[PDB]
Amino acid sequence: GMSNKFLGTWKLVSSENFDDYMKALGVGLATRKLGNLAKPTVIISKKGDIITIRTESTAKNTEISFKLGQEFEETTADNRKTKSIVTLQRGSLNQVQRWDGKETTIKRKLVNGKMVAECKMKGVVCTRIYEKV
Ligand SMILES: CCCCCCCCCCCCCCCC(=O)O
């Protein structure tokens, strides 16, 4: 299953092409400002087979809880209502969000002790790197 190395508190130390990603998502202007400024902590935890990903920033949180492979309802930080699934592929924790006939993916993998999140929307690709705190 999910490597226990995902578990813990993660801090954003690098982000590339995130504005373009948000723009691809049709994110509102206020949300883009927030997104480009925020340097969130991501907390990954588990209770039995329920995995939780909590994202905390200065004055805004998001949280999802899920079982691998089981679709669930999600309200994203930019307020999309998506049907989402998190799966495990070759150690990569892969999230897909679907809404309005659209699709975006967030793939998280551990690389040299860091967590690398790759976001893709219509060929726009984001990379956000987290270090263990
Ligand atoms: C809740 C703190 C973050 C605020 C960012 C708001 C801008 C909209 C973000 C929507 C998609 C974000 C995906 C981030 C992936 C990650 O690096 O965990």
Numbering used by the authors: -1 to 131
Give the original sentences from the paper that presented this experimental model.
P2 is a myelin-specific protein of the fatty acid binding protein (FABP) superfamily, which is able to stack lipid bilayers together, and it is a target for mutations in the human inherited neuropathy Charcot-Marie-Tooth disease. P2 belongs to the fatty acid binding protein (FABP) family, and the structure of P2 is typical for FABPs: the body of P2 is a barrel formed of 10 antiparallel β strands, and the loops that connect the β strands cover the open ends of the barrel. Inside the barrel, there is a large ligand binding pocket, typical for FABPs. Phe57 is in a central position in the portal region, and it is believed to regulate ligand entry into the internal cavity in FABPs.
Mutagenesis of Phe57 into alanine (F57A) highlighted specific roles for Phe57 in ligand binding and structural integrity of the portal region. P2-F57A was crystallized in three different crystal forms under similar conditions, and the crystal structure was solved from all of them. Phe57 lies at the tip of the β3-β4 loop, close to the bound fatty acid. The fatty acid, originating from the E. coli expression host, was modelled as palmitate. In line with CD spectroscopy, no large-scale changes in P2 structure were induced by the mutation in the crystal state. Once the C-H...π interaction gets eliminated in P2-F57A, both helix α2 and the β3-β4 loop alter their positions: helix α2 turns inwards towards the palmitate bound in the cavity, and the β3-β4 loop bends outwards, slightly opening the portal region. In different crystal forms of P2-F57A, helix α2 and loop β3-β4 are in slightly different conformations. The bound fatty acid adopts a more elongated conformation in F57A-P2 than in wild-type P2, correlating with the conformation of the β3-β4 loop. For a deeper understanding of P2 folding and intramolecular interactions, residue interaction networks and centralities in the crystal structures were characterized and compared between wt-P2 and P2-F57A; all six independent F57A molecules in the three crystal structures with different space groups were included in the analysis. The possibility of crystallizing in different conformations indicates an increasing flexibility of the portal region, linked to the missing stabilizing C-H…π interactions of Phe57.
